[PDB]
């Protein structure tokens, strides 16, 4: 269930609250699988979390 969870500035919390209130994955949910990214500009290596 691809949820963007965007709205970088301030509405990310609003989107999370709307998803929680609307019961997006309340029942019948196995895993969450949250994963974005990383980038270390100094060392020069990226990372996948």
């Amino acid at each position: 269930y691809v949820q963007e969870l965007g709205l970088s500035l301030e509405e990310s919390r609003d989107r999370l609250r709307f998803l929680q209130l609307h019961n997006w994955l309340d029942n019948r949910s196995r895993a969450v699988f949250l994963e974005l990214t990383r980038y270390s500009p100094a060392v020069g290596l990226h990372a996948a979390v």
Binding site: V2, G6, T37
Partner: protein, 49 residues
């Protein structure tokens, strides 16, 4: 209780004005399994899966 987790340590880590060059917004990809699950097991829970 992972929603308070996200609201407390994840969103500040991503959108905070600190050392975290994300290189792309995060995402969520859960499962639905097309079938609900029984309630919590009284006493002992499921062994592994």
């Amino acid at each position: 209780e992972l929603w308070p987790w996200m609201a407390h340590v994840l969103l500040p880590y991503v959108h905070g004005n600190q050392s975290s060059p994300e290189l792309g917004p995060p995402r969520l990809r859960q499962v639905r399994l097309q079938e609900a699950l029984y309630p919590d097991p009284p006493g002992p829970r499921v062994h592994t899966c």
